[PDB]
Specification:
Chains A, B, C, D: Exists in a monomer-dimer equilibrium with the dimer being the active species. Chains A, B, C, D: It is found in: Host nucleus. Chains A, B, C, D: This is Assemblin. Chains A, B, C, D: It comes from Human herpesvirus 2. Four copies of one chain form a homotetramer. By secondary structure, chain A is of the alpha+beta class. The first copy, chain A, has one domain: Serine Protease, Human Cytomegalovirus Protease, Chain A. Helices cover about 35% and strands about 20% of the residues of chain A. The first copy, chain A, has a seven-stranded mixed beta sheet. The radius of gyration of chain A is 16 Å and the shape is globular. Chains in contact: A-B, A-C, C-D. Chains A and B meet through helix 2, helix 3 and helix 6 of A and helix 2, helix 3 and helix 6 of B. The complex binds diisopropyl phosphonate (4 copies). The site of one diisopropyl phosphonate has 10 residues of chain B, from strand 5 and strand 6.
């Protein structure tokens, strides 16, 4: 019943100019992989809102790149119904809705294999180039990433298939009201942002994302 | 328990440049006042979300001006809790939140006394100069309005005091989930709006709003 | 200077219902691979209009799938200038223009390795499911193909990279006037088609193409 | 060498339902006739492509009707050669081709005698009932028009004979490449038109065109 959605994007870009604290480097990422424990995916750090699971994190010459799976029907409905949409097809309407509402990732860290805590989908992340892609196929989710080492692609596909076998069939169900409140919060807390689409456009460029994306920026 | 909030603003400006359909003129407004029936105030036209009542609508030389009352504790909690706010005192926080989240009014019309149907608080209205002010005192809510005919002030104060006497003590209770779902909707349907704060700044100027407003534009 | 464009799509679907003559089967395709000689890519069978080269043809359980490269700047200009376009970005404008003008492939056959003669880009092909995809990356061109054996993907990527090494740097230049006349011909000869977009939509479905494609059907 | 082709049709219908701007009325047309200066005929408003001349424009009770002459051998060759035609006799092939490729007229206007600027042959015009007829005889070109005031016929024949005497022998020669580039453009800019033949069928009915026309709609 749930539309399995794949998210892909950089958790961080290595020499991007992230402030002192936020910055991530090759050796620290090297030491965090593979993660000791699975990285759950939640909405706007509200840890009650688990909606998926990070399948693979690969250290790309540009930064730690990841691929996740979101199998949550409540998240679908809550979004589908909120959209008193004027302006398609079907799950594409869903792709269009999640991409533009939740265009960024945000990695939380607690060096060793337990450094990476979890990833949160959000409107605007704190590190650069953190704009993600959503699609119903892993290959389709990673394709808009043109500045990606060939090895990263081949490795993220391999790990992601195995990883899927485990949580095969798992669906998350955080609670429609929990979901509803969490997304209102994502809006209310980002209302004071002067034109967020500039940042989106800018960070989409830094990530090397290009193509016929649903992202309207 | 509810913090009575006063909304004030122009429902429309007379010679502003509103498209054919939306345009309002002095004669039509003349004929519509006083309203046959009280004007309820709701959030984003979702009639289920009645949160207040329009006390006075005076035909100012510039356009139909209004003053309304919002007495809803659910709206307060729904907003207060969504704000995982970083960044003043108390109900001022409340003022700050609603002002920037729902900065515009929108008058629905069904000429005679039954023309004006209701007013909806919203992010961006379709008529110019429709930026409102919120405050815990009627006098405070109308003060930022500098291009206001002296008669309009004395008239809007007089009717408001009376009008309040009737719905004195009334508190609206649409239901927190209805509120929660309506506000997310306000957020989702306006996500593709490029910048928005420009329009808010422009239309604030048009209305002649000036002062130490919570409106961050 | 030329934008290398990748085309991908089925040259034919195995049990699709193609008329007696046009039909292709597994064993006949098996016997034609690898092609004795490279398969050039031309516009609407006008053999003077060579604009690219077929990189790989892989026998997929569904039909012979191929991946080609178009490196032609004249084709770019002729299209870019014809489009007195109302309605983006850049080479995407080019992607949008070539996809919707030339949405199909047409394989010409002269069984043995010399069966496959060449492929022609055209508006509407004669065999079913022959709707192609164009993109600036091979991976991005094949991603909209969801009903594709995993082996096909891994094989078409391997062959295509090697093949590219040979014609690396090759650009085609058929002649802008030749190009101009050939494309007018594509239009004039398909004018009598009652709604071609129905077929496009239909044959896009038969191919298992899905996603945020430039193809406006 | 050129095959003189006669075009006939309504430049506009009086009470058809043309949007605000495009709408034409009897008085304005009255004032515009006769045209101050001859009306050249071109392909798709590209003023470089003058291919004929409007002989008569008579104000019929239904709308401004016209009869024009097209004497251009390049247009003939450009069309004849583009058609890698499968599928009657000769100049009839020519009739068949132009009729279905450029089935509509479009009157550009700059009220006084200088209102009408020129008419452009095109695929789909913006005003209703603008479907034209082509033939090698004026009488043949106006015959399909059944809802035509008897006066209009006798008037349009009379002025046409005279008008011809002046531009008697004139043959236009825009240049085959100009022609070739203009026609591709006609094709590229109308590629996103869903169906088109419906509109052609509808507007043929509106004009009151009936008969054994080459127009395949
Ligand atoms: P993330 O990018 O934050 C990590 C640095 C913890 O963004 C949050 C604010 C949603
Ligand atoms: P209001 O300004 O609309 C009235 C014209 C009915 O704005 C709506 C779209 C929230
Ligand atoms: P192709 O699909 O034709 C082969 C069968 C030779 O289409 C042509 C008519 C463009
Ligand atoms: P015509 O009908 O346009 C006039 C109104 C100028 O059609 C053009 C768009 C070819």
């Amino acid at each position: 019943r749930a539309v399995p959605i794949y998210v892909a994007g950089f958790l961080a870009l290595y020499d991007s100019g992230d402030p002192g604290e936020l910055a991530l480097d090759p050796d620290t990422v090297r030491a965090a992989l593979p993660p000791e424990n699975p990285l759950p995916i939640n909405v706007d750090h509200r840890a009650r809102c688990e909606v998926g699971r990070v399948l693979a994190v690969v250290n790309d010459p540009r930064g730690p790149f990841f691929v996740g799976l979101i199998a949550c029907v409540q998240l679908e409905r809550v979004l589908e119904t909120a959209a008193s949409a004027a302006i398609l097809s079907r799950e594409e309407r869903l792709l269009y809705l999640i991409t533009n509402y939740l265009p960024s990732v945000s990695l939380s860290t607690k060096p060793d294999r337990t450094l990476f805590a979890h990833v949160a989908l959000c409107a605007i992340g704190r590190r650069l180039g953190t704009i993600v892609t959503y699609d119903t196929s892993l290959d389709a989710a990673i394709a808009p990433f043109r500045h990606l080492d060939p090895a990263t692609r081949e490795g993220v596909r391999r790990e992601a298939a195995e990883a899927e076998l485990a949580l095969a069939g798992r669906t998350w169900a955080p609670g429609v009201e929990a979901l509803t409140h969490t997304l209102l919060s994502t809006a209310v807390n980002n209302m004071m942002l002067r034109d967020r689409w500039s940042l989106v456009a800018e960070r989409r460029r830094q990530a090397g994302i290009a193509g016929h994306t649903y992202l309207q920026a």
